[PDB]
Amino acid sequence: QTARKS
Amino acid sequence: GSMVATVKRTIRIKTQQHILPEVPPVENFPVRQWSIEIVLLDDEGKEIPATIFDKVIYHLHPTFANPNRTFTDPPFRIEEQGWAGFPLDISVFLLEKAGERKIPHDLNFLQESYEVEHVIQIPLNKPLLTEELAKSGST
């Protein structure tokens, strides 16, 4: 749920 | 100065997302279907169609194909698939060429759905836009 892109 | 001749309106960005199990995870991260829509709030806080924009362009992360996606009809719903949230830029174009506003949005997977409100300043010098603004509050 906290996955994020650079 | 020139900013006096404007009114403020609150727009509400509405995001939803869920996992697609039939899509193989990327580096163990599941791929999710996500959607964004945009509505306008009136002076009582009810959602109404954001007809003050004649165009919305979602500026997606460049890991997406053709990452600049144009929509012309409310609620300007975009749907995509991904694996990692990101800040994206939403360009909203007011009627009658009255101006572009760039709205920062955060696409994330913390909730199944979540809404974010943004205040924009809108000029009062374009008759067709001014008549449209009357639907959502005082002008």
Q: Would the CA dihedral through A3, B34, B50, B63 be positive or negative?
A: positive
Please give the method by which this entry was determined.
X-ray
Q: What is the resolution of this structure in A?
A: 1.9
The rounded distance, in Å, linking the Cα atoms of B125 and B44 is 24
SS3 B43: coil
What's the CATH code of the domain at B105?
2.60.40.1970
Instruction: Give the total number of structural domains in chain B.
Output: 1
Contact check, Cβ <8 Å, B110/A5: no
SS3 B117: strand
| Cross-strand pairs, B11 | B40, B118
Which residue segment(s) compose the domain that B62 sits in? 1-139
Residues 6 or more apart in contact with residue B34 via CB below 8 angstroms: B15, B16, B17, B79, B80, B81, B82, B107
Q: Token pair for residue B121? A: 């300043």
Contact check, Cβ <8 Å, B108/A5: no
Q: Other CB atoms closer than 10 Å to residue B50's CB: what's the count? A: 21
Name chain A contacts of B85, Cβ cutoff 8 Å: 3-5
Q: For tokens 């719903």, what's the residue?
A: B77
Q: Which of B135, B127, B136 is nearest to B42 (CA)?
A: B136
Q: Token pair for residue B7? A: 């009114």
